[PDB]
Amino acid sequence: PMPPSEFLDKLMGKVSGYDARIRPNFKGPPVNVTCNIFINSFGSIAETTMDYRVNIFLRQQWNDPRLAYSEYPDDSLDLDPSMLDSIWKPDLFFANEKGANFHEVTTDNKLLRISKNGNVLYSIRITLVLACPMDLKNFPMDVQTCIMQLESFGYTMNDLIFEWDEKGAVQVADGLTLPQFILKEEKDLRYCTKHYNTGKFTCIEARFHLERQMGYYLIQMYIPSLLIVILSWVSFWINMDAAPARVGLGITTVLTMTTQSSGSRASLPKVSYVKAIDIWMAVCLLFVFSALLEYAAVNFIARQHEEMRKLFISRAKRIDTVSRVAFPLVFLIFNIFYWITYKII
Amino acid sequence: PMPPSEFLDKLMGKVSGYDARIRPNFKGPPVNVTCNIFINSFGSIAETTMDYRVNIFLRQQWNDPRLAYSEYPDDSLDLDPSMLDSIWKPDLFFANEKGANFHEVTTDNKLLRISKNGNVLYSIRITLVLACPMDLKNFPMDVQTCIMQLESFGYTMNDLIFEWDEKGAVQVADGLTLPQFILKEEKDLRYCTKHYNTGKFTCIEARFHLERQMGYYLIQMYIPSLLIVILSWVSFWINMDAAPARVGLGITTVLTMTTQSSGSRASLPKVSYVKAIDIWMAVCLLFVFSALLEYAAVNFIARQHEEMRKLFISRAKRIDTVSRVAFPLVFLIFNIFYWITYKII
Amino acid sequence: PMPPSEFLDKLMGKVSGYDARIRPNFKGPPVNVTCNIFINSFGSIAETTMDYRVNIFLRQQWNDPRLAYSEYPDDSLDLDPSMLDSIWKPDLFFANEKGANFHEVTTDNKLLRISKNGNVLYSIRITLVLACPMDLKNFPMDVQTCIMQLESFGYTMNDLIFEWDEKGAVQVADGLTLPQFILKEEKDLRYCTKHYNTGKFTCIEARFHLERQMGYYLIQMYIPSLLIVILSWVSFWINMDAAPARVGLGITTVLTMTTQSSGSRASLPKVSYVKAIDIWMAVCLLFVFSALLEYAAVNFIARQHEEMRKLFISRAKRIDTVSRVAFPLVFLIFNIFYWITYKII
Amino acid sequence: PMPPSEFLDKLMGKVSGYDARIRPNFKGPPVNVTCNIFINSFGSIAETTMDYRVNIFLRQQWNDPRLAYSEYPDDSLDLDPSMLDSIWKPDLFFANEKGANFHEVTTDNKLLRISKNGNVLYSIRITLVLACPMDLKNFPMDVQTCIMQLESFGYTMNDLIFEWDEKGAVQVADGLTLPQFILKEEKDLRYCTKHYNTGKFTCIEARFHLERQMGYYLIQMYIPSLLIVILSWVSFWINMDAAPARVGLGITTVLTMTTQSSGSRASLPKVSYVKAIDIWMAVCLLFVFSALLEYAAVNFIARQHEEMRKLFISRAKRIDTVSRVAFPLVFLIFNIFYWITYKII
Amino acid sequence: PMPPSEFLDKLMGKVSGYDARIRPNFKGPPVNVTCNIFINSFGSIAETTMDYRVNIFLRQQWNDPRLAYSEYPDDSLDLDPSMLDSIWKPDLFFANEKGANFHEVTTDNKLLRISKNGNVLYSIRITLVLACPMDLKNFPMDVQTCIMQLESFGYTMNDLIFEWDEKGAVQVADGLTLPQFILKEEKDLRYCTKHYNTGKFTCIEARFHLERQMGYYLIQMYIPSLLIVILSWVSFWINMDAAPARVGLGITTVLTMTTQSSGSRASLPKVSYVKAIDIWMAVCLLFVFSALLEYAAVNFIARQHEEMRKLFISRAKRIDTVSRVAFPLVFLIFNIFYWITYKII
Ligand SMILES: *[C@@H]1O[C@H](CO)[C@@H](O[C@@H]2O[C@H](CO)[C@@H](O[C@@H]3O[C@H](CO)[C@@H](O)[C@H](O)[C@@H]3O)[C@H](O)[C@H]2NC(C)=O)[C@H](O)[C@H]1NC(C)=O
Ligand SMILES: *[C@@H]1O[C@H](CO)[C@@H](O[C@@H]2O[C@H](CO)[C@@H](O[C@@H]3O[C@H](CO)[C@@H](O)[C@H](O)[C@@H]3O)[C@H](O)[C@H]2NC(C)=O)[C@H](O)[C@H]1NC(C)=O
Ligand SMILES: *[C@@H]1O[C@H](CO)[C@@H](O[C@@H]2O[C@H](CO)[C@@H](O[C@@H]3O[C@H](CO)[C@@H](O)[C@H](O)[C@@H]3O)[C@H](O)[C@H]2NC(C)=O)[C@H](O)[C@H]1NC(C)=O
Ligand SMILES: *[C@@H]1O[C@H](CO)[C@@H](O[C@@H]2O[C@H](CO)[C@@H](O[C@@H]3O[C@H](CO)[C@@H](O)[C@H](O)[C@@H]3O)[C@H](O)[C@H]2NC(C)=O)[C@H](O)[C@H]1NC(C)=O
Ligand SMILES: *[C@@H]1O[C@H](CO)[C@@H](O[C@@H]2O[C@H](CO)[C@@H](O[C@@H]3O[C@H](CO)[C@@H](O)[C@H](O)[C@@H]3O)[C@H](O)[C@H]2NC(C)=O)[C@H](O)[C@H]1NC(C)=O
């Protein structure tokens, strides 16, 4: 008979009145576009720009009764992407694009299949730079939720309706990792139905749960800031009269706590509000700070100076055995009131 | 009757004389374009480039009496964005673009509605890289103001006038945060009316107030630089004759003040004039610097050396009890003359 | 006779029925496209974005019987790249593009040669920003495998089949280096044959083995962190009663281990899970940490204090000669259980 | 009468012989294009790429006698930017573009006004990434001069001549700052008249004088490196026999000078030749270096050891009072021969 | 007579048979294209991407006998860049582009001049991002060679031949600097004549010799690492029994050598193989490392302990005078075997 590329020019040409600027079922029921995506790549979750990029296969299915045919024998036709301007396509856009583009390598990466009863499959390949606001109040112990919503732009709710299909709405490719986060296998699928002063515009969204890994911040930032506080408690076991040994220990410890803190503020993000890791590196500074000011109290009582001269040594050794036990206990109370309050949020 | 996409080709074609290069109300009163924006995204406020990017919905409403109609029954038509070149559009441009682009994902994100009496709604989606000069003289305690102005380019004041509409001129999306600043809910709306040697060009602007958050700079930079100055005053309570303990304290303290200062100059911005945080890390260096030079004065008087040999110890202990009280008081006077002068600006 | 540029317009014009939207051997056997690439450049293997860019010569060969000819005398014609839209080209795309583009400098860098029997050579020049997920669990001792796969987009398995040619499928240019990795001369060539709900789409892939060089991390990060652990064992040979010498050595060594660790966390990548180098800089911190706590045990036993007063010195010298030998031996056990477990993975 | 958009199509159509590829006054006197710019934005003066970006209004005025008219009543017409290809425009380009682009937001930002006698105004909006070589031999004390030149490309000197207009050739917008430099209000305006083997091509240039601000480098780099040199002179006033106090002072001072130096080499630019700030941080290292080697000379003479045993103490106290005065004087001679030689260049 | 823009449409129109897809001298001798470039800008030589960008004037001269004319009186015509698609242009491409683009600011920066006998001058303006592999084995003392080669793409050796002209093939603009390198005035010009399985393709290349400047690395990295090794030899002149002074000197010196090393690894490039500067900062670490282990040998022999008790002091002072001279001599032998081996390569 006649080839499919010439059959579609007969179906959508100047004859048959198919105007590509008019939706199907015009002045009637709204077009029911069903959508499902397929994530190929997912990463570079920035926290200064607060965005993340994704590389999807956006599939769209709707019904168009003007494209139904019965003369041609085979079931599923296909339109070349160069002739794609002669099809009513839904004006889908992402409500938080923040920049995006298509792919045009060796062929426009666009697919169109017109079925026999009028069903139309439309699959394209988009690289998105989608934006999600991130809340870094508890920085190592956080669970991020970055949304992905698909509004309509020009058609209102009574003309065009988006829906996720009932069989695998959001898939993820198998071999896909992240440098910091992990992607949970729990995709929430819900409506949003945006309102304006213009009208009710449809939208569907898919939420992704991003859990941050921990093992770098414990090994490099919590454990070295733990051992420096333990070294600051060695001063309680060294003799009281060894005066160059005590202040040489108490201040080289607050120097290696400052070096550990300042050396790791470049690896941390640059938000301007107090994190979880920022509290830990400011309270572990206090336990090294409060372990010299006891020696400012120990060496001053012993220097006051008959049994009255022996009483001041008897009080300086009293405060050297209280704080020998109190500082490994007050730091343990903080070590409980820090992890419990961040495993509960 | 006839479809809307064929009704606009009759209205704006070679018939009816609608020339798209000629403004409405030609050789008469000026066109009154009323505008309102809708910010979707707002962030990446750079301070080296001195710019910020915004993602807006630019809505424009004017009146074009050549587009009025009464034969077609429905009230609001719509033109497809492929046929948008047959409409007089206002030549709005941002006076501080510094680069911008449209969005063309799955459809040109452009909307046009011609009402029955001739009112025209025109809504597009722009990603701007707008520029605002920033004044970082008092860096943690600053209130930035970044403008957003909308000039005309080719039409003068007697041909085209921009105005903000009287009902919600600038909206902001709800779930929108910033890494460093916060966005106040107070938008100043005013005219600017730019002049040149060419003529009076209209412009309307919208100012955004950006208050900088504080909690990172106190916990990581002010409080750790505070505790180092407190540790430098421990030298006044340690004994005078403990010579390896005093200079081992006074210089490991100026080393941990240099380590705290140099480790945080990478997180700070890179402007070349003195900030608020740069005065603090240069005066807190002086109090550690002036706490060794007293011991250079203490140890030198005691080394001068009968009651004349006991007078020099009596003067060295005098200056070790004056500066034991004076340095926590002179530093308190600076700590009042620093925050009061930056909560008043 | 007639020129070749006018002979191809007769062969592919409105006459002869050559429709460029229809594959050869239509409704018959599938088109056998044979492919081979030629890497010109290869580098910038990022580990935050997890991608790498490559600059290839993509050559494609297929058979198109509608382009066969016998009237023109010469064997191989050539079509100009401006007239390239009148050829059925395969819709090859890379399944992990993550952005790509052509090259259009002084001429479209595209080549087409139609042979006499219908064989078609098609060579283009593409810059890819291909993505490979990287596994930095053992960071200096790792072997990366970054794939490069070539799917079809619109044609299924029974219409278009990709194959590597049997003579040099993947070549690499000669003078081509890398900043960190080395590129092995072993290219795995295999099929993948992706399935969807749409159909069987063909794909061929080529794997590249990337081995990381070592010489920077040994000279700058392993050997300097080795010598600091050796300096921390000098404390066992210095006298027991030299109390400012022991704690002055044990804590300036944990300060130069913190300075070596924090100064090198900027050169390392910023993944959030524990590496191989991150274990080494956390266990070598413990051996400097555990060499002061022995002196907290030595100086405390000697301070307890007749032959009972001489027994406590006899036990403090016992633990000062056990750990004089034990710490160079326990660190040797870790130095065997660290390299063996990373030369075996 | 007739509208202006239809009057210019009569004036420049297929009738009247106006060919847009032929300059006015053909085979006669050269076209005198007078130019003036208007800088909107100016910043991001990079010193690794050695470029700076500017956002200008480029106005061009020439005479075109083929566009003169007398039938239409009004004085100044205007051509829409879509119809701008039917005008002879001068082929102005910037000789050091290094990348540039136009602006096309909501309308092409282009302006054209044909006057009655034939004078043509042409104003566009360009974002340039202009390049200027920078000479960082004396880095904080430098005055940069970055040119901006406007050549012709295809027409020689006897066909097209560029000139700055005699009334405000280069303006700058009012509220315009820079992060590091300041922009002087003194614009040099001169010709360059480039020669090649092709011919004499015209060019005009405008020079901008950029003076670098100072207040950050004094407060953060010169004054903290000054106070460390003063602390290194405290060793001359401490007693000679206090041997752990002297070398503990002289080497913790060369450590805080190294920490001040290495902590600030990330904020400095990364050129590979010696700056002004690089001499200051290498000579102030010597004054701390030369304050320990005197103590290596003090402690060695006193250790040589009857009145001959008292002569070695009598010489060690001689060199401890010479260098008590000499080092605050030799450093003052350097402090004069450093600022005078950099305020004179 | 007739204008030049209408004479070229007569010469290259549908009349006269000039087909722009066919080279001159078809089925005859190959076209001899002679080329010469003119570098406007040259910089941003990256070593992570291993590329450099250049901004050139590419001039091409060939002969086309179909464009010869004798009726028009003047010698040199010119074609407007809008009508440039009706000219056979050579398909020159750079073999290592790695991305490039043209310049289209106020006019397409393209020049074409057709002489009377058929000689065709063609000058364009290209911004290249050319790639050169760099060998950083001896990093401060290196001489880089970055090539620039110009292949043909579609025409083989028997159809199109590139040559450099015999009079100034590569010029460089006068006022042109670099941040790190210097550009030598010695350009090698040679052929390469690439082979494939496709055929012999012509290519000509130009080599640029880049020499790295030295003065920053001596002043900031070699001299401060030199003076720290000199300070580590002060320990040999201080008294043997001053035990807190020796280990306080030997380990604050290995701390300021680690601070000098770790603070400068951010300014160095990030290749993963050992450099020249990386050997220097790892051998100068050993001379500070081996200056404490001698004191571990000095203090241990003196602690062994009648004239047998005086023999151990007599051996400890022997090794304190051998290594007083040996370490300034062994370090001098390394200082000769380090510069001589890097001035010879
Ligand atoms: C696309 O989806 C819309 C909404 O999901 C469909 O519109 C709905 O059509 C059904 C039947 O065609 C109607 O709902 C029910 O109809 C019965 C019979 O008239 C009536 O008794 C019920 O009270 C109810 O209205 C209704 O017209 C309409 N809306 C809703 C909310 O159900 C539409 O059919 C779908 N397909 C197309 C091609 O548009
Ligand atoms: C667009 O806005 C402009 C300015 O806002 C309008 O022009 C103004 O039109 C009004 C009446 O149409 C005039 O103002 C007053 O008119 C009365 C009656 O003639 C006169 O007695 C007053 O002295 C005053 O002029 C005036 O012509 C004009 N300008 C101002 C400043 O009021 C215009 O009508 C608006 N609409 C359109 C479609 O252009
Ligand atoms: C392109 O490649 C395909 C598959 O590689 C080729 O299709 C294969 O064609 C061969 C012979 O033309 C057939 O295989 C065998 O054919 C014999 C003879 O009929 C039969 O007895 C065997 O049982 C077997 O089917 C077969 O039709 C087909 N598929 C396979 C799997 O062999 C094709 O010929 C190639 N060329 C073109 C121009 O498409
Ligand atoms: C554009 O500018 C050029 C140069 O600035 C103008 O060309 C100059 O025209 C003037 C008079 O039209 C001539 O200069 C003098 O002319 C008198 C009278 O013939 C003669 O006695 C003098 O010796 C001198 O040549 C001259 O032809 C020409 N060049 C110079 C250097 O003055 C031109 O008129 C301007 N306008 C246009 C529309 O091209
Ligand atoms: C472009 O360049 C090519 C090669 O440089 C030129 O081709 C050469 O043309 C010359 C003479 O036209 C020939 O070389 C010699 O010719 C003499 C006389 O026939 C013969 O006796 C010698 O043995 C030698 O072949 C030759 O045909 C050819 N190739 C070489 C290698 O010399 C060509 O003429 C240049 N011009 C054009 C417009 O193509």
As an assembly, this protein is homopentamer
Distinct small-molecule ligands in the complex: a molecule of 3 linked components (NAG-NAG-BMA)
Strand percentage of chain A lies at: 15-25%
SSE order of chain A in H/E notation?
HEEEEEEEEEEEEEHHHHH
The structure class of chain A reads alpha+beta
Gyration radius of chain A, to the nearest Å?
A: 33 Å
Molecular shape of chain A: rod-shaped
The tally of domains of chain A stands at 2
Number of strands of chain A: 13
Largest sheet of chain A: 7 strands, mixed
Largest Cβ-defined interface: B-D, 71 and 66 residues
What proportion of the residues of chain A is helical, as a percent range?
25-40%
Number of helices of chain A: 6
End-to-end Cα distance of chain A, whole Å, is: 68 Å
Binding site for Zn(2+) (chains A, B, C, D, E): 186, 188, 209
GO cellular component, one term (chains A, B, C, D, E): dendrite
GO molecular function, one term (chains A, B, C, D, E): transmitter-gated monoatomic ion channel activity
Glycosylation sites (chains A, B, C, D, E): 32
